[PDB]
Amino acid sequence: QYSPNTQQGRTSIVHLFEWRWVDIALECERYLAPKGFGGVQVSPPNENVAIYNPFRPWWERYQPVSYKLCTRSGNEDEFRNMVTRCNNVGVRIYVDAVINHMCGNAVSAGTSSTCGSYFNPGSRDFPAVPYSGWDFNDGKCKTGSGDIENYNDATQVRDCRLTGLLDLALEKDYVRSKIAEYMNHLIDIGVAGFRLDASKHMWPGDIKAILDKLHNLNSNWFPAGSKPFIYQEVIDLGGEPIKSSDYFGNGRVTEFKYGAKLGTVIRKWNGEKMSYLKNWGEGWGFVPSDRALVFVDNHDNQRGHGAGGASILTFWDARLYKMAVGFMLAHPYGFTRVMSSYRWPRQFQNGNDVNDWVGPPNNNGVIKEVTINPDTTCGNDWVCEHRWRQIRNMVIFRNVVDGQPFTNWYDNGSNQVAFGRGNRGFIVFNNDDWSFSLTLQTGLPAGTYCDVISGDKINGNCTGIKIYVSDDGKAHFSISNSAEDPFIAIHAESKL
């Protein structure tokens, strides 16, 4: 459950947040495969409540109504089509599995659902699965309200309703079997793994009992005996009774300390400095590298209300954001996920964004297609961070240096730092308020290297900055603090 099951030499996944299946299928073929991306995390593919006030928020997709593969992203045919086309060019699909709960207990009964299925939350009837009142934790939860009230009590965090969402009785074999039937449907279609949403609110042993029921991966695309990649969403910043290590038996875990700390560092908040990153990783109290799924932001905390609050860097802070993603992709810690977002009309009142609910770009609720602009970014207000040259080229850097040790660290005791990955890559950051002009040991073989942040290697030409590594492995780097992107990265495949 710890292995991503990506193709040889692909080392990252991209969250195509709220994309339609047909657009993800195209993206696999036209971009993700040639540029070396490992896989795609997709939005939950099962039927969910259609919420009309507010109008179609992104988080309606975390309120299941059934396990039919029928959403605003597309139907089962389009989902199957996407998974087949991506697998056929060596790009995996990871599914956001919403299995802690069904929808909110106060949702009005009827057929306001993305496939028209009937459901009745008050009477706990989800006949499209089917679930009944016997399948929920109403009798198990011990709080007066029936909701989660105290996070110092690890039991109610698991058995009570998360903000009123109907909590499934995951100890029951029938419920485990309905969930496993859903995930096995997806596995046989060809998905490579799962993000387990809201894992903190599930018992580790109930998760294990569901995973015990899963098939091996589809043997047309994966070696025999391959197991689904499992990464569990657990927000563990310390100070709570539930620890993310309690979930290591089931798979990896999201390391939410990673982006919160990196954001504060690169923003230079709370006395932090980039030079402090010399011991980045478990030296900062993170989970072991082989159990971590890391990221700068995710779809949730990029809206500023989440784990890290305002320190999380997002596409809205593009200049610092590119630096943070670059550091993450160059550093060996963890398995890396890159965010790909859409724009919304952000409107902060008291440090919190009243429009943080707004869903994907839409015409009257129908999601807009991803259009590709001439400069290979995206239109229709899809941000497509994963197509930004500075980010895509660092996805490739991480492929090229895969396996090589963190080495040749430099820092100025402030915010100018550099390091190499074996003899395959070197990266240099200037986050101080003065220029960085210095000769550094790069570890790389002698020659001329294209800086892949400012440009690209095309044929035997560079379109941006060129770095000259001498026979001793040393190279001069000049980075103004005014530079558009104040970092430089070179690697074995950017050498002329």
């Binding site: 928020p57 988080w59 975390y62 949730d300 989440g306």
Partner: peptide, 9 residues
């Protein structure tokens, strides 16, 4: 809480 504090909406 969860989902960018969805319940406040």
């Amino acid at each position: 809480x969860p989902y960018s504090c969805w319940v406040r909406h």
